[PDB]
Each structure stands twice: as structure tokens, then as C-alpha cells.
Amino acid sequence: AKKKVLIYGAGSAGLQLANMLRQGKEFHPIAFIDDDRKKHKTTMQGITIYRPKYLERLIKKHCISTVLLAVPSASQVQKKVIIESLAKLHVEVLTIPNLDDLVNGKLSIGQLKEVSIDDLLG
């Protein structure tokens, strides 16, 4: 079976990511995490979106060892907080490309890379 993941970010990029992954053979998106309270417990792309307080319980419930980060329009300060929060939970974190690479069209949303120091600091 495909590797189960959470996608952190249920904005345009994250939803598009879930759609692509569902079709693919590598990852199965089980749910989204999103900081936007208005999306809490709403359904998009056929799965549930949750506030970040649900991170640990979902990781343990579903035995998730990988979270995909799709928050291209978040500030650097916010992205750092997110990555740090995930690091404490002992999951691998992969990220879609930076916003400029997305909007200028030189990298696909689906091009995932492991996060690095460069990603944390900015």
C-alpha cells in the first residue's frame, strides 16, 4: 500500500498536491492540517482538514511517518514554526517548491524535497 501522509496546508497548493498524490503510486493523503480555523473539520479532496492541535493524534492513529509541507504563501516565520512543530513529533518532512518557483512555473507542486536548514531559517 502507498505510504500514508498528512499534508500540512489545505490552500490551493495542498489541495492540488493531494489530488496528484491520490492519482499516483507513492503516497496516500490521509488528512490535511491547516492553521485556518474556518477550515477545521471541513472536507476537501475527499478528506478531512484539521487545526494543528490534531497533529500528534493523527500521526499516532494512522502510524504516519511523513508529513508533506504545502504552505508556499506562509511567511518564513510561520513556516519555521511549522517545521519545528513537526520535528518534535519525529516525522520526516518533505516540502513542495518555494512560492516563486511555483508562480513563475519552473517547478511542479508535486516536486517534493526533504526540508533543510535553508528551509527553516530562510
Binding residues for Cl ion (CB under 5 A): 11-13, 71-73
Stretch of 35-43, 58-66, 87-95, 113-121 contacting its own copies, by CB under 8 A:
35-43
For its own copies, the closer of residues 65 and 111 by Cβ is 111
Is there binding between residue 16 and its own copies (CB under 8 A)? yes
* Amino acid of residue 16: Q
Q: Which among 67, 88, 83, 94 has a CA at the least distance from the CA of 120?
A: 83
Which DSSP string do the residues of 96-122 spell out, in sequence order?
PPPHHHHHTTSS-TT--EE--HHHHH-
Q: CA end-to-end span of the chain, whole Å? A: 35
Whole-number Å distance between alpha carbons of 110 and 29: 13
Is there binding between residue 73 and its own copies (CB under 8 A)? yes
Q: Which among 50, 46, 44 has a CA at the least distance from the CA of 67?
A: 50
Among 39, 47, 79, 83, binds its own copies (CB under 8 A): 39
- Among Cl ion, its own copies, none, the one that 83 touches (CB under a kind-dependent 5 to 8 A) is none
**What is the contact surface with its own copies in residues (CB under 8 A)?**
10-16, 19-20, 35-36, 38-39, 42-44, 72-73, 75, 78, 99-100, 102-103
